[PDB]
Amino acid sequence: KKQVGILGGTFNPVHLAHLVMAEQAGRNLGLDRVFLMPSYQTIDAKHRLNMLELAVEDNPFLQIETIELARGGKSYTYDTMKELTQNNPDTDYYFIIGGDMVEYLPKWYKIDELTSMVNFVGIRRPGYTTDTPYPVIWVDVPEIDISSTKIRQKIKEGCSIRYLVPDKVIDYIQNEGLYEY
């Protein structure tokens, strides 16, 4: 009986806050490992995946779940977790979301069933409340106020992203000429 975390996102590009959130939530709960799960869709997914793999490269605790990139199309989270739980029927999944996202959990397709499928884990964040419907358990993570949009904006404006983004990922962005449009 495995316990596995999932951190979803576009990861466009992956950055330090993704790594801290995944490692801290998983390690604090004592999960076996945490997967960063890129969503489908504008740069090609191969790039997002290469950067993701570079970012988690040296750390067996963090891995990449690619099922959403392969299946494409609709991708409601319920459908994804339904495939993952059928593939891994003895795995307890811990679906990690930022405290800010916990509010929109009603907008989630078949959130009813989804909460019976997986364990939602909220990341306590300043400003947003620790209250919600649905069974969410919470974990404390140092606030890291970085977002992929912020990074892309900094790249577009020609500002530094060092330490906000892993060195191997910065090198890839520059080698492939990403985000400078």
Ligand X SMILES: Nc1ncnc2[nH]cnc12
> What are the residues binding its own copies (CB under 8 A)?
16, 19-20, 23-24, 27-28, 59, 126-127, 142-146, 150, 159-160, 162-164
∠ CA 82-83-84, rounded to 5°: 90
Nearer to its own copies, 3 or 75 (CB): 3
Report what 142 binds from its own copies, ligand X, Mg ion, none; CB cut-off 5-8 Å by kind: its own copies
Q: Note whether 3 and 32 are within 8 A (CB).
A: yes
Residue 148 lies near ligand X (rule: CB under 6 A): yes
Rg for the chain (alpha carbons), in Å? Answer: 16
Residue 120 lies near ligand X (rule: CB under 6 A): no
DSSP 19: H
Report what 19 binds from Mg ion, ligand X, its own copies, none; CB cut-off 5-8 Å by kind: its own copies
The span from the CA of 181 to the CA of 57, in Å, is 28
Minimum Å distance from CB 89 to ligand X? 28
Selection from 52, 150, 35 nearest residue 87 by Cα: 35
Among the residue ranges 11-19, 25-33, 45-53, 81-89, the one whose residues contact Mg ion (CB under 5 A): 81-89
Nearer to Mg ion, 39 or 91 (CB): 91
Where helices occur in 39-122 by DSSP H, the ranges are 45-55, 67-71, 77-87, 111-117
Nearer to its own copies, 63 or 80 (CB): 63
The span from the CA of 64 to the CA of 91, in Å, is 16
Binding site as annotated, residues for adenine:
10, 15, 18, 148
